[PDB]
Structure 1
Amino acid sequence: DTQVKLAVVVKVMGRTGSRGQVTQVRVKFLDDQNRLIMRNVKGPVREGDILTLLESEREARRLR
């Protein structure tokens, strides 16, 4: 029973993927605002977007 948690995209680091189709962003957690994690995001995403996030403790790695 994970409770879906929220983040804001502070900066868009890049655009990874074989076909360059998974944005790699750096998210900051709303519920406790000192946790910043690098995640993968698909589709158009800009700065300040709020992302719902089912499972939290996974993170990506630079140029995944």
Structure 2
Amino acid sequence: DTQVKLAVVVKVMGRTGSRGQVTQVRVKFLDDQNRLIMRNVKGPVREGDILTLLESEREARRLR
């Protein structure tokens, strides 16, 4: 099974996608405040938003 994990956008990196509709941010896990990983988010997002992750493992790559 999977458990929904909760993360915080700590810095926002850029705008990926063909049409720039996706942002790339670095998130930080609230339970383990040592695991910082890259994710892609759809929709407006600033520094400090809390992102819900259905799975935690998937980690984006630079300029994905």
TM-score, length-scaled by structure 1? 0.97
Can you give the 5+ residue segments of structure 2 that lack an aligned partner in the other structure? none
Can you give the 5+ residue segments of structure 1 that lack an aligned partner in the other structure? none
CA distance in structure 2 between the aligned counterparts of 1:46 and 1:23, rounded to whole angstroms: 10
| 1:46 CA displacement | 0.5
| 1:34 CA displacement | 0.3
CA distance in structure 2 between the aligned counterparts of 1:41 and 1:5, rounded to whole angstroms: 15
| 1:44 CA displacement | 0.1
CA distance in structure 1 between the aligned counterparts of 2:10 and 2:23, rounded to whole angstroms: 13
| 1:20 CA displacement | 0.4
CA distance in structure 2 between the aligned counterparts of 1:63 and 1:29, rounded to whole angstroms: 22
| 1:55 CA displacement | 0.8
Partner of 1:28 in structure 2?
A: 28
| 1:22 CA displacement | 0.6
CA distance in structure 2 between the aligned counterparts of 1:41 and 1:24, rounded to whole angstroms: 6
Q: What whole-Å deviation, never above 9, does each CA across 1:26-59 have from its counterpart, x for those lacking one?
A: 0000011000000000010110000000011101
The runs of at least 4 aligned residues of structure 1 exceeding 6 Å deviation read: none
CA distance in structure 2 between the aligned counterparts of 1:30 and 1:6, rounded to whole angstroms: 6
| 1:16 CA displacement | 0.4
CA distance in structure 2 between the aligned counterparts of 1:10 and 1:60, rounded to whole angstroms: 15
